[PDB]
Design a protein around this ligand. Structure first.
Ligand SMILES: Nc1ccn([C@H]2C[C@H](O)[C@@H](COP(=O)(O)O)O2)c(=O)n1
Length: 121
């Protein structure tokens, strides 16, 4: 509905199935590519390296409570690259440290069928 646009924002900001690891150069490139450095440098962002459909599938795991108190969150273990703004970055040269790992994540899902719409934690 308007959930699709939330879903697309999520894909853009958090899904890169093609890579699997992350070095600093990846973050600097991808943070720009995915439009998270156009105005200011987004300080921290997580990219998930899994197939869109493996991710969508998390929405079918047991419901758990989000940080905002809603019950539509779901937890799962996935390959990520986390990008942090370095101490040497400025706008427009936004600059980052990658931190690749396989880790638990929590996503809000909404809709019918249920798609991910929001990274909770
Ligand atoms: N590793 C993470 C975890 C969460 N968020 C952000 C994504 C969401 O946009 C925001 C919460 O707001 P929204 O309700 O728009 O999802 O937190 C992020 O950028 N990087």
């Amino acid at each position: 509905k308007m959930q699709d646009r939330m879903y697309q924002r999520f894909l853009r900001q958090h899904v890169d199935p093609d890579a699997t690891g992350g070095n600093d150069a990846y973050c600097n490139l991808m943070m720009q590519r995915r439009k998270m450095t156009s105005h200011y440098c987004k300080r921290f962002n997580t990219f998930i390296h899994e197939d869109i459909w493996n991710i969508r599938s998390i929405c079918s795991t047991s419901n758990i409570q989000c940080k905002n108190g809603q019950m539509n969150c779901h937890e799962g273990v996935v390959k990520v690259t986390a990008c942090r703004e370095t101490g040497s970055s400025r706008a427009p040269n936004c600059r980052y440290r990658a931190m690749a790992s396989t880790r638990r994540v929590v996503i809000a899902c909404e809709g019918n069928p249920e798609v991910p719409v929001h990274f909770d934690k």
